[PDB]
């Protein structure tokens, strides 16, 4: 009984839900860190999938999830949740990860 749910990307468009996108983002942020768990972040997100779910709400939830795992035993989560948030702020301001040129930005602002 597959429903084939849709997610809403940042540019308004929709596509099939693909969990590998979430896997790659977390694997990117946890690279080089010690005693962190991609699996932990996903399961503790308790992310509720509905057809048409905003991709920004998905990402903002896993930020809170990784942020709440910052502990004495797993201190490197302070950097996992930070990289997820820096990544989030790049999209919010630029629509991509790579920032524009310093001159081009000042002109627009």
């Amino acid at each position: 009984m597959n429903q084939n749910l849709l997610v809403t990307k940042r540019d308004g468009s929709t596509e099939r839900i693909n969990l590998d996108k979430i896997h790659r983002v977390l694997d990117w942020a946890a690279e080089g860190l010690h005693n962190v768990s991609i699996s932990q972040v996903e399961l503790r997100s308790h992310i509720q999938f509905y057809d048409g779910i905003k991709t920004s709400d998905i990402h903002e939830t896993i930020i809170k999830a990784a942020a709440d795992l910052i502990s004495r035993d797993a201190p490197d989560y302070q950097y996992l949740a930070a990289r997820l948030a820096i990544f989030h702020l790049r999209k919010k301001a630029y629509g991509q990860f790579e920032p524009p040129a310093l001159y081009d930005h000042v002109v627009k602002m």
């Binding site: 009984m1 597959n2 429903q3 969990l19 590998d20 896997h23 694997d27 010690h34 005693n35 962190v36 768990s37 991609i38 699996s39 932990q40 996903e42 399961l43 997100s45 992310i47």
Partner: protein, 357 residues
């Protein structure tokens, strides 16, 4: 040859674990190794039945799962049904004609018996989530992705059973059977026993714990919770089982039980390392089949393969084998949950004057 009641009156406390005099009188007031008596008492106290677990909600959850998550769950269930199918009969067939102390004989029978409850619980789970269980069971023997791993594990049992039959019928020595020459070496038989126990330890302490991760990953999402309740009881048994094979292996390897066995353990140390590493690679390969159609929240190929390497290092170190994989922190820490049980208003002005501003 093997006898069901040996005539000799022997001091059972001085017999070895294996290949000594076949057990005659079954007594439990004394033990040579009390680890097996404790394992018996502990397994009997854990006695559970599958029907005592509510699995009614699991039928709804399963039908609601995405198509590829149905695949992950039912493939992990078929593989479980296979492994504990072997484990139901094999310790009884392969070890009972070799055991020579009573506490180990009865533990092996208790060990095997507890496995049949697992086999029955798999039937219970299957018949409560699918419409025709025959579709699920018939795929266990014919599906090419499962039976490949069956013959790897069963071979160690089969080869030990065969040499045991020659050792009982012909005894040790060089023989001719239908012209062809047949050599029966007790040292080569002790070697097949050791290698078999190593295979079973990797089966119960690595292969099944990889399967536990899948069953409990559905439960961390509050799905298939009736299955998870049963798998949790099974995991509690499986912890006793691997403890048994670890204690056998380490007692054999240290020469404490049989001095000859210590060197035989060293001649196998390379085979046993390759045996464990192979099991890990086989389970890593099995993970690729589970997620061939997609992954789920909290578990994919990489996560499960990391757990394979994580749990393999632990198990192999427990039996004196070199670690084959890199050091790693637990990639699924959530799995450990399932694998274990005013103002005092008074002032003193005189004391304050005793002070220089």
């Amino acid at each position: 040859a093997y006898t069901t009641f040996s005539q000799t009156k022997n001091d059972q406390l001085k017999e070895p674990m294996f290949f000594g005099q076949p057990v005659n009188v079954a007594r439990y007031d004394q033990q040579k190794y009390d680890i097996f008596e404790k394992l018996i008492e502990k397994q009997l106290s854990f006695f559970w039945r599958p029907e005592e677990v509510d699995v009614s909600r699991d039928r709804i959850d399963y039908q609601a799962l995405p198509e590829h998550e149905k695949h992950i769950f039912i493939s992990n269930l078929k593989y479980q049904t296979l492994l504990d199918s072997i484990q139901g009969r094999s310790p009884n067939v392969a070890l009972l004609p070799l055991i020579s102390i009573p506490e180990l004989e009865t533990w092996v029978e208790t060990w095997a018996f507890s496995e049949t409850i697992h086999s029955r619980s798999y039937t219970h789970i299957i018949r409560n989530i699918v419409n025709d269980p025959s579709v699920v069971f018939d795929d266990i023997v014919t599906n090419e992705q499962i039976q490949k791993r069956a013959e790897g594990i069963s071979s160690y049992y089969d080869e030990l059973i065969e040499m045991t039959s020659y050792w009982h019928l012909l005894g040790e020595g060089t023989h001719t059977v239908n012209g062809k020459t047949v050599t029966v070496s007790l040292r080569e038989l002790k070697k097949k026993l050791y290698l078999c126990l190593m295979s079973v330890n990797a089966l119960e302490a690595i292969r099944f714990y990889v399967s536990f991760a899948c069953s409990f990953a559905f439960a961390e999402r509050e799905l298939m919770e009736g299955n998870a309740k049963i798998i949790r009881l099974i995991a509690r048994d499986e912890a006793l089982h691997l403890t048994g094979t670890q204690h056998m292996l380490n007692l054999l390897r240290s020469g404490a039980d049989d001095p000859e066995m210590a060197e035989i353990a060293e001649e196998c140390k390379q085979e046993c390392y390759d045996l464990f590493v192979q099991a890990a690679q086989q389970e890593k390969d099995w993970a690729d089949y589970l997620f061939r159609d997609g992954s789920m929240i909290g578990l994919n190929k990489d996560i499960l393969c990391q757990y394979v390497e994580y749990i393999t290092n632990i198990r192999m170190q427990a039996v004196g084998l070199d670690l084959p994989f890199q050091t790693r922190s637990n990639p699924i820490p959530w799995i450990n949950t399932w694998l274990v049980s005013q103002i005092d208003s008074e002032v003193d002005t005189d004391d304050l004057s005793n002070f220089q501003l």
